[PDB]
Design a binder for this molecule. Sequence first.
Ligand code: I6W
Ligand code: I77
Length: 9
Amino acid sequence: LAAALAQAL
Ligand SMILES: *C(=O)c1ccc(-c2ccc(C(=O)OCC)cn2)nc1
Ligand SMILES: *NNC(=O)c1ccc(-c2ccc(C(N)=O)cn2)nc1
């Protein structure tokens, strides 16, 4: 989940 969002950065 964290990675799914982290791709933005
Ligand atoms: C959420 O974006 C998220 C959470 C966890 C994972 C993930 C990917 C790969 C592994 C892995 O290779 O584990 C080996 C024990 C674990 N968790 N991806 C994305
Ligand atoms: N928000 N994330 C990024 O901007 C980001 C872009 C690219 C990468 C990355 C990581 C690792 C490799 C590699 N070849 O091992 C390439 N690009 N991370 C984050």
